[PDB]
């Protein structure tokens, strides 16, 4: 129990890290959407102004 919850937190922390550093622009959109966490197909294309 308590231990497994801590591990979940650790996993959550690892997940946040992986999002920020491997998936460049996403910090802005994390707030609102509650429900169905569907794995939004991170179209890589947009960044380069160039």
């Amino acid at each position: 129990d308590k231990y497994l919850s801590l591990e979940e937190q650790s996993t959550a922390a690892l997940t946040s890290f992986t999002k920020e550093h491997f998936f460049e622009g996403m910090s802005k959109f994390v707030e609102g959407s509650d429900e169905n966490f569907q794995l939004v197909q991170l179209n890589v294309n947009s960044f380069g102004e160039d």
Binding site: Y3, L6, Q9, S10, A13, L14, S16, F17
Partner: protein, 103 residues
Amino acid sequence: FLRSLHDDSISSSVHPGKEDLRSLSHQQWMSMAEKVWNTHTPNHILAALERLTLNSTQELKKLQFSQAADLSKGPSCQLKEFSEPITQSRSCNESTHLDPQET
């Protein structure tokens, strides 16, 4: 041990004779793990694991803050000369001559 398995899986170099050594290492861990469960109470072991887990989480957060700081410091920042030669800087080495990293 797991890391060693990992590095090997990644480096495709199946040196013939490594299996005897793996088994031994695996047995060594098994003995140690067994000893741990014989010597200490399950309650204390789990408590120890909880703490290890908290530590591990805190380390990850620190790494997140440190990497964010490295991305925002895009270069205007001037080479401040700070002084004492205290830290060896040896780390896992010593290494960092490279930063010519001119943009």
